[PDB]
């Protein structure tokens, strides 16, 4: 409690306080009676044995009723000197309940991070702490993960300080179902390597205003979060050499088209839509002529309109505050919400049976009038073009019948394209504002996947979201579980295989690979003889009772139809092929493709500026991303959900048990006790560890990195029983790094202190002649001041000003005398910049040369990579 | 701590004079300086010491007391005299040999980042500003700084 | 004037090397980018 005072009002919120801990030493205990039991109701009860007869124990629960179990009690309880611990994996027994019970009192006590093992787990606390404040940033500058409470600025800092010394690229993955804060852990970490930066342009004030400016197009309201992230996204800063910001880059994944047109019961559509509609700003409602009724329009007014938790009016502010800031123009952002108004105009469109002849005409020509002007189109030829499509067979132009569902499903699908060209736009825009000059040196990227659901009605667009759910949890189980288990083979290191039984390829080998769920959708996805019902057939003859995780639909309590249940990670989810088709092939008119290549605006044109099945591109850009991941070291954020009700405080058991365990947080924390979390190499060991013991390495004596390193390790008085030595790599264990690290830190501490108050004494010296200089200016200054007043303007020196430009021969001499220093200078200038013009020119042929044999072996790859999928057949 | 009346001689009284009276910072006053603003006198005066020295010498004031109070020219001239008999500094080869474990190869230069790092938050630690003030005019094209030119600038200066 | 002139010369000629070199930045990390890719492709 001594320290602690620049956290602020936020203190009590990370880490309690010392009368807390010493009142908790004092809670009675017994650790021989004091046991975890589990329950049916609840999950797990604290109780204290009675009696053990043989097999049977029995005990009485802390609620007082009297249970036995069959030796599941030897589930021991913790000493009272283990609670609220922000390395929960220091616990002397770790378990289940112990960890259950570690994050319920934490998150009781308004605690929501934690450290597990070397990844961070975070509770959603649906209550906006104070925790995230400035000064709370401005305390976490330079903390290490013991030396600071647990929070996501800490997370943020390790992972910078690794990307530092290792010289690597960092990657901090964040991880957690439907609205369990990934968004606002982004931000937070966004926010801190911004606030960072801007300790020493306008770069941070863009990253932090791009998070709102895709909230608007892509963050929509679903039945589990009020602002559910449905794009998943990956934003990478790229940090200069001197650790000062460089640059910045998002990359966007699939957004759900079907929200834009099509919204269930409890949901909304995307919140640009809605935000336009609170009419904060009156030129946006009639510039776009829209309706103020958000009811008036069919695509926005399906499920819900509004939300008491979301006040749409200041979103619409920030969103515009946003994109003025971002470097938009105001034709840009016009020419935007124009085309927004279009898309809810699209709705409006009535079309009607010509002469009973099944054939389309408009009905309503005044919404049509609307949506052509505000993309500056030709109404009749757009309304002749949705009518009557006119496909190109052979080198003939014949125009296509099509009755009023064929037309209005068509206007969706254009109104789906569109604004999927719109959001990706956007995203070219922001990485193009954001991708300033030197993008240099190693980079950091938070990614932020979009979350596991479970609607009552799931179909396409809740699958692909599932199953790169599962893939990252798939590569959180290869990078802790696996990876690190054959390093210790590979390391010479005595260790024996944990079957830890999280390894899930069985499900996505029953999607990703090829003959897989998603792989047929793809390959009769080019059959247009091919129906819904058919392909789903086709699931039951292909996978159906050859593999456990597809599965029978359940179709429970009579909720809506399901067609096949997939048993994912996350509990068991059930799908409906109805409408799969036409949502993976995603044809579009092309006659209103090419009314839109010769718009009136230019966005419109660009969007469009030309027109690869949407689940094959999809699965390539995840392959890309878990390739992108692996090449980077990375740092978990887990994220769990208190309670599905959004009741801040209260945390149900079973859920939050259920999360733990699907997520793996528990097995994680086995191999960061009883593996070797940490490793390090000979030679770097041997560098950077020399003022540990230089006794035992005399200067010159670098023979052998392992005798080396050996001897500076048993030279020192750290327990020598923890570590193992391997080829290259010595294996630690626990805090045993940390020790080593702050043994360093304080003998160069001593150093750096002195070199410190050298260093700022120079300083000091510096900014005294600096002010002595300035103090001598204004000393000139009065000094000249005095002269005028002795002089004051008595006519005699009027005649001697006057006399002045008759007799200026020592000015002009001066005039030449400055005219040859300026001379020299800019020959020296000539001849510094012609240098480093040269040097630059060499530089420029030699990386050249490089990048032209890099493309001509990228080209090689790539027609290896086809002739082996076309032997793939 | 302890105030000793005699630990000078006449002509750098002159000096020390000067110096205060052309540094300065209130204008309304000529005799009175700062409480806060004495150590950065102290420091720019020729002499450096650590933050953990200046609060030892100085009774071990408070922050408040550094900006409010003040203090007279002559009574903190003696604890100036004390701070150069001091003279609790290291060496080139000292500095350089602390100093070089901050590398991974022993190239004889170091990294900008990780030198900022372990000069704010390693020991006592240093205003940002301050150090982005010192290392400007010196950082190399890559940020691998040379140390041995840093000290022998940072002494030379 | 002509001394003027080659200075003025001079210093274009290193502005758009400078950005040249950083189009030089854009283009190597774009083939990073395209050596990760065929890392995927593998
Ligand atoms: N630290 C936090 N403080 C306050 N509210 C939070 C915090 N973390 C999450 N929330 C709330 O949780 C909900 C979901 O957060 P969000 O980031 O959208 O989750 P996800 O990205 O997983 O869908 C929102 O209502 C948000 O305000
Ligand atoms: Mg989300």
Request: glycine share 6%; proline share 3%.
């Amino acid at each position: 409690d001594s320290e602690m005072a620049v956290f602020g009002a936020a203190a009590p919120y990370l880490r309690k306080s010392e009368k807390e801990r010493l009142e908790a030493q004092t809670r009675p205990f017994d650790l021989k009676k004091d046991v975890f039991v589990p329950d049916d109701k609840q999950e797990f009860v604290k109780a204290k044995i009675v009696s053990r007869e043989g097999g049977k124990v029995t005990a009485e629960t802390e609620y007082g009723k009297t249970v036995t179990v069959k030796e599941d009690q030897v589930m021991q309880q913790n000493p009272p000197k283990f609670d609220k611990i922000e390395d929960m994996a220091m616990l002397t027994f770790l378990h289940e309940p112990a960890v259950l019970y570690n994050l319920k009192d934490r998150y009781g006590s308004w605690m929501i991070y934690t450290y597990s093992g070397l990844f961070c787990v975070t509770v959603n606390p649906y209550k906006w702490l104070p925790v995230y404040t400035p000064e709370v940033v401005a305390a976490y500058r330079g903390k290490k993960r013991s030396e600071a409470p647990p929070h996501i600025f800490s997370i943020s800092d390790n992972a910078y300080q690794y990307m530092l010394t290792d010289r690597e690229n960092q990657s901090i993955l964040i991880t957690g179902e439907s609205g369990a804060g990934k968004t606002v852990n982004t931000k937070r970490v966004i926010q801190y390597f911004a606030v960072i930066a801007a300790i020493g342009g306008t770069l941070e004030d863009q990253i932090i205003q791009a998070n709102p400016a895709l909230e608007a197009f892509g963050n929509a309201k679903t039945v589990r979060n009020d602002n559910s992230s449905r794009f998943g996204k990956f934003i990478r800063i790229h940090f200069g050499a001197t650790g000062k910001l460089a640059s910045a880059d998002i990359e966007t994944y699939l957004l759900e088209k079907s929200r834009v047109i099509f919204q269930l019961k409890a949901e909304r559509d995307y919140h640009i839509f809605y935000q336009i509609l609170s009419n904060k700003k009156p030129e946006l409602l009639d510039m776009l002529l829209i309706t103020n009724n958000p009811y008036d329009y069919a695509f926005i007014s399906q499920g819900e309109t509004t939300v008491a938790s979301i006040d749409d009016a200041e979103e619409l502010m920030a969103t515009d505050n946003a994109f003025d800031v971002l470097g938009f123009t105001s034709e840009e952002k016009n020419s935007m919400y124009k085309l927004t108004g279009a898309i809810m105009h699209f709705g409006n469109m009535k079309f009607k049976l010509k002469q009973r002849e099944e054939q389309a005409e408009p009905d309503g020509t005044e919404e049509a009038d609307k949506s052509a002007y505000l993309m500056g189109l030709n109404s009749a030829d757009l309304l002749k073009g949705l009518c009557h499509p006119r496909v190109k067979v052979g080198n003939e132009y014949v125009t296509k019948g099509q009755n009023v569902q064929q037309v209005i499903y068509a206007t969706g699908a254009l109104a789906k394209a569109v604004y999927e060209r719109m959001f990706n736009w956007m995203v070219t825009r922001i990485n193009a504002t954001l991708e300033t000059k030197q993008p240099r040196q190693y980079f950091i990227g938070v990614l932020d996947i979009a979350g596991f659901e479970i609607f009552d009605f799931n179909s396409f667009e809740q699958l692909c979201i599932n199953f790169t759910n599962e893939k990252l949890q798939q590569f959180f189980n290869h990078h802790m579980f696996v990876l690190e288990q054959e390093e210790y083979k590979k390391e010479g290191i005595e260790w024996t295989f944990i079957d830890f039984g999280m390894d899930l390829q069985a499900c996505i080998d029953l999607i990703e690979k090829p003959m897989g769920i998603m792989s047929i959708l793809e390959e009769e996805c080019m059959f247009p003889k091919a129906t819904d019902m058919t392909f789903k057939a086709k699931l039951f003859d292909n996978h159906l009772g050859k593999s456990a995780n597809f599965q029978k639909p359940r179709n429970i309590k009579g909720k809506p139809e399901a067609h096949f249940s997939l048993i994912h990670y996350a509990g068991i989810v059930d799908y409906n092929i109805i409408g799969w088709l036409q949502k993976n092939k995603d044809p579009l008119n092309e006659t209103v493709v090419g009314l839109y290549q010769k718009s009136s605006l230019k966005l419109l044109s660009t969007l469009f500026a030309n027109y690869q099945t949407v689940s094959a591109l999809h699965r390539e850009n995840l392959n890309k991303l878990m390739t992108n991941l692996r090449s980077t070291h990375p740092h978990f954020v887990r994220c769990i959900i208190p309670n599905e009700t959004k009741s801040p405080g209260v945390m149900d058991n079973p859920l939050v048990m259920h999360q733990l365990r699907c997520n793996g947080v528990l097995e994680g924390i086995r191999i960061c006790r009883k593996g070797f979390p940490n490793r390090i190499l000979y030679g770097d060991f041997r560098q950077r560890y020399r003022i540990l013991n230089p006794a035992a390495i005399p200067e010159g004596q670098f023979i052998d990195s392992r005798k080396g390193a050996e001897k500076l390790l048993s030279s020192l008085d750290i327990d020598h029983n923890q570590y193992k030595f391997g080829h290259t790599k010595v294996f630690f264990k626990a805090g045993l790094l940390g020790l080593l690290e702050e043994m360093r830190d304080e003998r160069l501490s001593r150093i750096i202190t002195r070199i410190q108050a050298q260093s700022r004494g120079v300083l000091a010296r510096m900014e005294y002649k600096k002010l002595l200089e300035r103090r001598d200016s204004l000393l000139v200054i009065q000094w000249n001041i005095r002269a005028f007043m002795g002089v004051k303007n008595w006519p005699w020196m009027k005649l001697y000003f006057k006399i002045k430009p008759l007799l200026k021969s020592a000015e002009r001499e001066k005039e030449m005398a400055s005219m040859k220093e300026e001379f020299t200078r800019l020959k020296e200038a000539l001849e510094k910049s012609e240098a480093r013009r040269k040097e630059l020119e060499e530089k420029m042929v030699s990386l050249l040369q490089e990048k032209n044999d890099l493309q001509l072996q990228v080209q090689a790859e790539q027609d290896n990579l086809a002739d082996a999928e076309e032997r793939c057949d | 701590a302890s105030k000793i009346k005699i630990e000078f001689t006449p002509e750098q009284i002159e000096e020390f004079k000067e110096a205060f009276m052309l540094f300065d910072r209130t204008p309304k006053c000529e005799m009175k300086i700062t409480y806060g603003q004495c150590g950065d006198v102290l420091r720019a005066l020729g002499q450096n010491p650590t933050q953990a020295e200046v609060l030892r010498v100085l009774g071990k004031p408070r922050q408040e007391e550094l900006n409010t109070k003040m203090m007279d020219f002559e009574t903190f001239l003696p604890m100036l005299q004390h701070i150069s008999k001091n003279k609790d500094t290291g060496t080139y080869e000292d500095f350089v040999e602390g100093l070089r474990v901050f590398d991974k190869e022993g190239n004889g230069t170091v990294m900008g980042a990780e030198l900022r790092h372990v000069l704010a938050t390693l020991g006592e630690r240093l205003t940002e500003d301050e150090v982005e003030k010192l290392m400007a005019g010196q950082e190399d094209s890559n940020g691998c700084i040379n140390y041995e030119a840093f000290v022998k600038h940072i002494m030379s200066s």
